[PDB]
Amino acid sequence: PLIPQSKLPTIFTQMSALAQQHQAINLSQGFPDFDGPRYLQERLAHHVAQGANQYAPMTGVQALREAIAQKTERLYGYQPDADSDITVTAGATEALYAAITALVRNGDEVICFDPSYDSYAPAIALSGGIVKRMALQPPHFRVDWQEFAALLSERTRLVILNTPHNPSATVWQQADFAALWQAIAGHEIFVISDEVYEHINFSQQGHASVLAHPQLRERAVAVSSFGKTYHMTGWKVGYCVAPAPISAEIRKVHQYLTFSVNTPAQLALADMLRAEPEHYLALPDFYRQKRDILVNALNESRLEILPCEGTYFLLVDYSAVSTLDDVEFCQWLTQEHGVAAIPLSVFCADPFPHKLIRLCFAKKESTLLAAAERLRQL
């Protein structure tokens, strides 16, 4: 038995096991416990039946890329080229890995922000990139542009940002993108904007996308996730929008990663985009309702809430209630009050000196109400 030497030297699985062993309300898992639109499900079955089950084009089904182009135009006032700027991928996860892999060379420095979604770091490492982390500080987790400016070097190749922000639930304002552009304008720095929660922004101001900034747009990759937008994360279909030159390099990697993406699913997704276009304009109110169920319960609790601007996650400060560290507090919470959450420390590379936990409210009303009742015991 020959053993490989890892080129990359379980939390989410503990919580669901502890939540199961103690019948705790699951608010840790970052996906819905309700299903998606059946129109989409119905169109999938229709395309499978019509026999559209063989390889799809490498860049994605034509109808889908064109439908995505139109959506982009309606939303951000600019129309990408459907044949060269849009690429369908097996989930946003693959788009991120493809974009990162296409842009990061050995020794390149990539600026990221913590707390962070855990998939960026590994991809950057597999391409031999160096991660430079900015530690966003609670409660507002705003980007300290002066700290940012200091992280730049001649090796800075890419900036990966996530907005709305998982796990902090904060969002980037138009002004933040303006500041990013002012900071990287004179440098050869690419931008990857993880905007999978693009339709879950509670500001009246609306979602501020990198695609709305004319200059950043020409040097950036926007990543979206259908699984996240249509409440069906297991469908694994996403895409990225980027200038032709950049999308071309994303495609070179993608083509050998998976080559093509589930064909029926794509056609179904195309139908959904064309049949119910204003569908996402409703998601903000849809999730704001769910968010408040948890917020109102926590206002009668010794637990404190941080402002939730986006994503379907919420941050809670348990200082007044306990002295334990977040990881073990969550274990205590699950075991003593039947509510499972995720400690914010698992999203940080370096020590996080705070008493914050992440709660997901992308759940059925009954789940949120049951959670609310238990949160009110603290």
Ligand X SMILES: Cc1ncc(COP(=O)(O)O)c(C=O)c1O
Q: How far is the CB of 52 from its own copies (least distance, A)?
A: 7
Cα 50–chain centre separation: 33
CA distance 157 to 103: 8
Q: How far is the CB of 321 from its own copies (least distance, A)?
A: 31
CA distance 291 to 330: 20
Residue 265 contact among its own copies, ligand X, none, beta carbon within 5 to 8 Å by kind: its own copies
Question: Is the Cβ of residue 62 or residue 119 nearer to ligand X in the bound state?
Answer: 119
Among 56, 159, 160, 196, binds ligand X (CB under 6 A): 196
CA distance 133 to 353: 16
45 binds its own copies (CB under 8 A): yes
Beta bridge mates, 305: 316
Q: Which two tokens stand for residue 155?
A: 């090796």
36 binds ligand X (CB under 6 A): no
Binding mask 86-125 for its own copies (x = CB under 8 A): ----xx-xx--x---xxx-xx------------x--xx--
In Å, what is the CA distance from 148 to each residue of 53, 110, 159, 333, 352? Answer: 47, 12, 10, 36, 19
180 binds its own copies (CB under 8 A): no
194 binds ligand X (CB under 6 A): yes
Q: How far is the CB of 116 from its own copies (least distance, A)?
A: 13
Residue 218 contact among its own copies, ligand X, none, beta carbon within 5 to 8 Å by kind: its own copies
DSSP 97-113: HHHHHHH--TT-EEEEE
Residue 196 contact among ligand X, its own copies, none, beta carbon within 5 to 8 Å by kind: ligand X
Residues that contact ligand X, how many (by CB under 6 A): 15
Question: Is the Cβ of residue 127 or residue 168 nearer to its own copies in the bound state?
Answer: 127
Strand order across the beta sheet in which 109-114 lies: 86-89, 238-241, 220-225, 190-194, 156-162, 109-114, 130-135
Q: Which residues contact 51 (CB under 8 A, 6 or more apart)?
A: none
Residue 54 contact among ligand X, its own copies, none, beta carbon within 5 to 8 Å by kind: its own copies
117 binds ligand X (CB under 6 A): yes
Question: Is the Cβ of residue 121 or residue 321 nearer to ligand X in the bound state?
Answer: 121
Among 62, 84, 137, 233, binds ligand X (CB under 6 A): 233
Cα 131–chain centre separation: 19
63 binds its own copies (CB under 8 A): no
Cis before residue 115, ω within 30 degrees of 0? yes
CA distance 242 to 214: 12
CA distance 322 to 57: 55
With vertex at residue 169, the alpha carbon angle to CA 167 and CA 171, rounded to the nearest 5 degrees, is 120
Question: Which residues here bind its own copies, judged by CB under 8 A?
Answer: 1-8, 13, 31-33, 35-36, 41, 44-45, 48-49, 51-57, 90-91, 93-94, 97, 101-103, 105-106, 119, 122-123, 126-128, 188, 190, 218-219, 231-236, 243, 245-246, 248-249, 252-253, 255-265
Question: Which residues here bind ligand X, judged by CB under 6 A?
Answer: 30, 91-93, 117, 162, 166, 194, 196, 225, 227-228, 233, 236, 238
